[PDB]
Structures are given as structure tokens and as C-alpha cells.
Symmetry: D2
Subunit: 114 residues, 4 copies
């Protein structure tokens, strides 16, 4: 299945934060309605935050996360969870190798803000 | 129901990250096995990270999040989600007197690391 | 926090299914835009299905689950999870007593159908 | 990633229930510690329940869901969600074609029971 794609409400501010847990340098591309709006690049094996930004979901509300390491696309896993019918988390794990921890880059998208 | 309490595997490194979205200064207390091991204090209305740490779940694996503002306990909501039977997120929202949204402090716990 | 309330897309068919795990007779009321549209009643300590129906979310998309035993409201926990940005589950547990298994009536709402 | 695989606590009773939403006849196989222990077969485009059973997770706790249509494996999506640190849902969607609704067979695993 396609993973790492989420529908947000239109024209909504959201947070995106990426963590790294891999010997590989992670490149996380964030697209809003099919256009790159942020790229986070970093390396950590201890969950360092490699990027955190506030963005807007735009007219179409489409947010997509892609992850690569040295030009190779990582395999993604994702889900969205909603608490109290209002607090939203869109969650991405990614795997750059064979141990299948899916923590090599982790991305958390949260809304609403404010 | 009690919220903000999670059972982790024993002796496991985990990340804890807190974001703020409130006029009130948030105090986030992290307890591991019934002892405070981290306190994040900060304030933002635009999803600033008010703390990010790597902790260990210890012998018992018990992790509890409490949130207060000006000494008053915020109301919590929480859940845990597991992706690919291995990537874990424990999620907490909190609501203070100032804004009736569970985003006033948002806490994300993630494991495994490395 | 209020639990058991979910916003569905408007005018959308959804499934609602309730299971029982309690000595007490469970009553599950399903309300769509603040009107009861189905009630499931039954008793089981072995996860029997006490009702399953297809409903429509109507104009407003508001779906609320209420659980009671002999007129006493149970304590509810809930969340919504979305897979592949398309398959939705709204989940409710309920506790009618003191053991805190939260499974006394369990309700699963799923969409889309077809 | 390998979807539809979940680690349950050992020797635990759990419910498994499957719904169908497809023109194709769905076969759901449930494996506990690498042995098939239940099989549900049916066809519906309106979320009919094609099976529900109570099973035990055994010593290993490994539960796997496979879905096929005329012997062709469907593509799976899955996640596990825990409410109140105690009430567990393991959730599977499946796609038998390319419209990507992931509802063609929907499987819900719940525990604890009783
Ligand atoms: C730069 C580099 C080196 C290596 C060895 C790899 S890898 O082994 O294919 N994967 C990275 C690997 O890093 C470990 C520290 C651990 O976090 C694993 O889960 C992770 O997959 C890569 C990709 C890059
Ligand atoms: C205060 C209270 C309420 C109820 C409903 C009961 S009961 O119905 O007799 N027992 C509910 C109880 O049933 C067990 C078999 C188990 O499933 C529990 O999780 C469930 O709460 C009593 C006795 C008291
Ligand atoms: C590759 C492929 C497989 C299948 C099983 C079919 S089908 O059975 O003719 N149609 C499956 C299809 O049914 C629709 C009513 C809808 O529920 C779809 O989501 C579902 O996938 C085809 C045509 C092709
Ligand atoms: Ca890895
Ligand atoms: Ca890793
Ligand atoms: Ca707020
Ligand atoms: Ca109970
Ligand atoms: Ca019970
Ligand atoms: Ca389909
Ligand atoms: Ca379908």
C-alpha cells in the first residue's frame, strides 16, 4: 500500500518533526499538494530531532512524507490516530535496511496548533 | 479512565518529546516507575518543542505523563499505536483552563531507538 | 475528555458492531447527528456480537456511542485510527464495574463500505 | 513491511472478526504460532460479517492474518492500538484489486475477553 500520505483539513497549520535512529544519513522530504515544502537531513542513532517545522496544508490538504538514504528510497509504514475527536497525529516509520525496526527515520505530524 | 500511563518493555530506551500550544506555561512531568525523571517547562502558541530527551523504562517499564499549568492539573487523553508490530508511539494530549483543546501540551513517546 | 464521539465524512455508509464481555446486560446506543438510530442489547462473557448494522452518517457526520448497563452509564475510552489514508476505524471500550478491563461492551465502527 | 502480524500476550483469549466489502469472495486465514486455527470465507459488498471466533494466543503469542481471493494474496495494511493501557485492538485492511479502498476484507482482533 502507499504509505506516508495524509489528508489534512484544508489551509491548516500543522507541525512536522523528524527523528533519526540509524547509521545512515536520513533525507526526509515533506510535500504539500505534490510540492516539496521542507527537507530535513540528518544523522543520529539516538533519536535526535533532525527537523521540526510549522507548515500549512494548503488548499488540497495533501501531506506526503518521503524518506531516502544516499538516494535510495526507504520503505515506509504509517497511520493516523485521532484522540478526543480533535487531536491528530500522522505517524511515519521508515526502514533503510533489513532489521525492520522502522525507526531509521521517524516522522510525527501534529495538528491542530495554537 | 486513567490516561497518560503506558507499559513499555523493561530496560528500554525511549524518546519523549513535548510540544506546546497554549498561552499558559506548561509543566510536563515524566515519571518512570513512579519517580519523576524529567520535567519540561515551556511556553508557546506555535508548537515549539519544550523538551526532548532519551530515557530508559527501567525495571518496571512504567511511564506516566502528567501536565500542569500554574499548578493546576490538565485533563489528559492518550493512546498507544504500534506499526509493523515493532514501532511504538505513546501519545498524550492535554487541556488546560486557557484553551479547551487537547493540544495545549502534546507529548510523543517513541521506541525503539538506535 | 468526552469519549465515543467521532466525526465521519458526511452522508457516508458505515458499519457499527458491538461485542460483549461482562456478566451485565449491555446497551449500546448509536446516535447520528444527535439522534438515536440503533440500539444493541445483549449479554455475553465470551465476546458475542450483540449487534452489527450498516448506517449513514447523515449531513453532519456526527456519530456518538453511549454504553449503559441497566440505566447506569459505563465509563468509555475511544480513539480513531486511519490506515492507508482511507480505511477508518473508530473504536470504543467501556467499563461497567471496577476491574478496569474496559471490554464490557466493545464497539467498532468501520468505513468505507462497498 | 510485513503487515497483519501481531504479538499478543501469551496464553490469552482473543476475538477475531472479519467483514467483507468486495465483489470477490474473501478467504481470511488466522494463524496462531504458525498454525492455521480459523478460516472465514464469504462475500458481501455491505460489510457482512463473514466470521467471528474466540481463539487463544498460545505460548508464543504470534497472530497472523492472511487474506486471499481465489488464492491470490490481498495486499494488507495493519496496526495495533491500545486504549487505557489495557484494551487492545489489532486491525487489518486488505485490498484485492487496485481501487485501494483496503476494505475488501476487514479484520478486527480484540483482547482481553471476559
Ligand atoms: C551509512 C550506512 C551504514 C549502514 C551499515 C547502513 S545499513 O546497515 O543498511 N542500515 C542502517 C542501520 O543503522 C543501524 C545503526 C540501525 O539503526 C539499523 O536499524 C539501521 O537500519 C546504512 C543504511 C547506512
Ligand atoms: C457495579 C457492578 C456492575 C455490574 C455490571 C456488575 S455485573 O454485571 O454483575 N459484572 C460485570 C463484570 O462481569 C465480569 C464477568 C467481568 O466481565 C467484568 O469485567 C465485568 O465488569 C457488578 C457485579 C457490579
Ligand atoms: C485483480 C482483481 C481482483 C478482484 C477480486 C476483482 S473483483 O472481485 O471483480 N472486484 C473486487 C472489487 O469489488 C468492488 C465492488 C469494490 O469493493 C472493490 O474495492 C473491490 O476491490 C477485480 C475486478 C480485479
Ligand atoms: Ca533499520
Ligand atoms: Ca534503526
Ligand atoms: Ca491550545
Ligand atoms: Ca469490566
Ligand atoms: Ca469484562
Ligand atoms: Ca478494493
Ligand atoms: Ca471494497
Amino acid at each position: 500500500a502507499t504509505q506516508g500520505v495524509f489528508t489534512l483539513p484544508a489551509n491548516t497549520q500543522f507541525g512536522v518533526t523528524a527523528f533519526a535512529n540509524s547509521a545512515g544519513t536520513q533525507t526526509v522530504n515533506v510535500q504539500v499538494n505534490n510540492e516539496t515544502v521542507a527537507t530535513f537531513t540528518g544523522q543520529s542513532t539516538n533519536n535526535a530531532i533532525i527537523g521540526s517545522k510549522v507548515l500549512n496544508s494548503g488548499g488540497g490538504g495533501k501531506v506526503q512524507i518521503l524518506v531516502s538514504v544516499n538516494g535510495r528510497s526507504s520503505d515506509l509504514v504509517s497511520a493516523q490516530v485521532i484522540l478526543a475527536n480533535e487531536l491528530n497525529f500522522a505517524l511515519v516509520g521508515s526502514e533503510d535496511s533489513t532489521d525492520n525496526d522502522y525507526n531509521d527515520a521517524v516522522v510525527v505530524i501534529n495538528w491542530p496548533l495554537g
